[PDB]
Amino acid sequence: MTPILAAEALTYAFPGGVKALDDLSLAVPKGESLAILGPNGAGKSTLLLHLNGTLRPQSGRVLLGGTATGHSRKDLTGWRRRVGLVLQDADDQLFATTVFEDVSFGPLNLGLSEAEARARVEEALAALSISDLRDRPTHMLSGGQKRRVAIAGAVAMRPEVLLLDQPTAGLDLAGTEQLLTLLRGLRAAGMTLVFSTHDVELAAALADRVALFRTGRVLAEGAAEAVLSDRATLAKVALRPPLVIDLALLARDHGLLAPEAPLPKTRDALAAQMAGWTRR
Amino acid sequence: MTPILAAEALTYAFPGGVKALDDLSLAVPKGESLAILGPNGAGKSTLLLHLNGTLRPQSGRVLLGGTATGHSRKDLTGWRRRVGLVLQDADDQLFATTVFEDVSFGPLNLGLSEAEARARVEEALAALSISDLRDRPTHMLSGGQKRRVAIAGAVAMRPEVLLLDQPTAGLDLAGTEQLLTLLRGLRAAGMTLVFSTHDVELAAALADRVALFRTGRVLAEGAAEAVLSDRATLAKVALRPPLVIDLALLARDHGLLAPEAPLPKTRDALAAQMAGWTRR
Ligand SMILES: Nc1ncnc2c1ncn2[C@@H]1O[C@H](COP(=O)(O)OP(=O)(O)CP(=O)(O)O)[C@@H](O)[C@H]1O
Ligand SMILES: Nc1ncnc2c1ncn2[C@@H]1O[C@H](COP(=O)(O)OP(=O)(O)CP(=O)(O)O)[C@@H](O)[C@H]1O
Ligand SMILES: [Mg+2]
Ligand SMILES: [Mg+2]
Numbered sequence: 001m002t003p004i005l006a007a008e009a010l011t012y013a014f015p016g017g018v019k020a021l022d023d024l025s026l027a028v029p030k031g032e033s034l035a036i037l038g039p040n041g042a043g044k045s046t047l048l049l050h051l052n053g054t055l056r057p058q059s060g061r062v063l064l065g066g067t068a069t070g071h072s073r074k075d076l077t078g079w080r081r082r083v084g085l086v087l088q089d090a091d092d093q094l095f096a097t098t099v100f101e102d103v104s105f106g107p108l109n110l111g112l113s114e115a116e117a118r119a120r121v122e123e124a125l126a127a128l129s130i131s132d133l134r135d136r137p138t139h140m141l142s143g144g145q146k147r148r149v150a151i152a153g154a155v156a157m158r159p160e161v162l163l164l165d166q167p168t169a170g171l172d173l174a175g176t177e178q179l180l181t182l183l184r185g186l187r188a189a190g191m192t193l194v195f196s197t198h199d200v201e202l203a204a205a206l207a208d209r210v211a212l213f214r215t216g217r218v219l220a221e222g223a224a225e226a227v228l229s230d231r232a233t234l235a236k237v238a239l240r241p242p243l244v245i246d247l248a249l250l251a252r253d254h255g256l257l258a259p260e261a262p263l264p265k266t267r268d269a270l271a272a273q274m275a276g277w278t279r280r
Numbered sequence: 281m282t283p284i285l286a287a288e289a290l291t292y293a294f295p296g297g298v299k300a301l302d303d304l305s306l307a308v309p310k311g312e313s314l315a316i317l318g319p320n321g322a323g324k325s326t327l328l329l330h331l332n333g334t335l336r337p338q339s340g341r342v343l344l345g346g347t348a349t350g351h352s353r354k355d356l357t358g359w360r361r362r363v364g365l366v367l368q369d370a371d372d373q374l375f376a377t378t379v380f381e382d383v384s385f386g387p388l389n390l391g392l393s394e395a396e397a398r399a400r401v402e403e404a405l406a407a408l409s410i411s412d413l414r415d416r417p418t419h420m421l422s423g424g425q426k427r428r429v430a431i432a433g434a435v436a437m438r439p440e441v442l443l444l445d446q447p448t449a450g451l452d453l454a455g456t457e458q459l460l461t462l463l464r465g466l467r468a469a470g471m472t473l474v475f476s477t478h479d480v481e482l483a484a485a486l487a488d489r490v491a492l493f494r495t496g497r498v499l500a501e502g503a504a505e506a507v508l509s510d511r512a513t514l515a516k517v518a519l520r521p522p523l524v525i526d527l528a529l530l531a532r533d534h535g536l537l538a539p540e541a542p543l544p545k546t547r548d549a550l551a552a553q554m555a556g557w558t559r560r
Contacts, residue, residue, distance in 0.1 A: 040455060
């Protein structure tokens, strides 16, 4: 059970000297969904860019399938086929073409025939509800529409690992729920997911494991439920628990539960508890 | 007349023909905080770009202080000084220079002294905890840091009206709380706020009024608590009440809230009410 991806002791400063990763290590079990959380500037984006080989560290290394990645053209090509990335700014990921052309580029560049590439593209467009935008120039789109196009282009590649940098920023509710359904489906099909987010509710909905970043290091890592219900540890990266868990931890302290009972984590669970409560 | 801004019957299609605003009317009372919500592509950004005179409609008009604006160079300059806009994409708003210089340009272009400009810059940077980035090149920043710099540049100009296009996208929790504090202070000083967002919790925390956009038109507008608790109307733009408000409504359903008090509209407010609950 070697992880599919492992960051080992990554240290990276940008040209110009700004330090971004400081001895960062993080292992990603195959088939898991890993949420990465932490403050602006903690190094989440830079870490994702190391995991698909966009950036190379000054020290440390990334392992893919248990082996050090290698830095050749064939190496990097194989690496990027296996590990896809949806950038934080979707506009940076788009080409000056129509939506269909944009999403087609990847599968075609994979040396796929016209037919298998076509099927990939059509399914990706449908999965993100942008089929009707196929002939739209990518610049003639709203921010949330652009986000869908960028995600569709990545998913059309069917990578072994999908990295997403703040995938739901700017998405409307319908789009967020549709993306959740898609990502759950891809995971069920065996895909590994790593996503940065400031949405702790998204982490709660999608992650098996959670890593908290601060100042270029992993401050804490564990199963999603254990980390997301830990008020003191989350506070060290200036986060609160997901709202229902937040309140429900408060309820447990206040003596509203049992005691002996499990913590309500859903709206439904909390609603059921409320019927046994009154005002003082 | 009385509202500080009024969109009257705005119709706009982009070059190339994509329709964006469809006979849209929206009035903004001076001093209010207005949230604009609605699906990706609904026309939220396009409307904001009409309100500060960036885009000119094919039909309809914008009134500023009850007066039709006009489109001369000097009309536009005066309009933009009175109505600032934080763009949806921070990179579109940042100059290729240091953070301090970027934020200083607005005040300096207003004809203020270097001493006044300096004070405005330092106040804006400190409000969003980025004083220590003053000499950082704006490209050498994370997405959330860039968001803070763009907001700082707009608030340093101290406009009559501040428009914010999805200002918390990519922002961490601390940044969001600091933005709320900043915006509350600016409004107390008399500033009018209009913000587009997909974060309905932000709307709950910050808005006096909420407008719901659908396919280029205002579907509904009203007092924030009324709109954000209106399950039926929210469903028409594929929204639900914010989780805090859902839980507050749920609490009221079980009589756990103030006979007649306004709903808790923030996590802290909901948590406070919890202190007064006991088991049956
Ligand atoms: N530069 C551009 N050229 C052409 N059409 C554009 C455009 N920018 C946006 N559009 C189109 O104009 C309409 C309104 O887009 P707008 O960006 O105002 O929506 P919005 O701000 O509500 C969406 P989002 O929440 O996704 O940011 C949509 O149909 C969109 O595809
Ligand atoms: N292109 C660039 N050049 C130089 N420094 C950069 C940079 N992009 C980011 N940085 C810096 O690198 C560090 C890590 O930033 P990174 O963008 O990886 O973090 P992050 O993704 O956790 C933040 P966010 O939540 O704001 O998107 C910060 O100190 C940031 O200012
Ligand atoms: Mg980032
Ligand atoms: Mg927009």
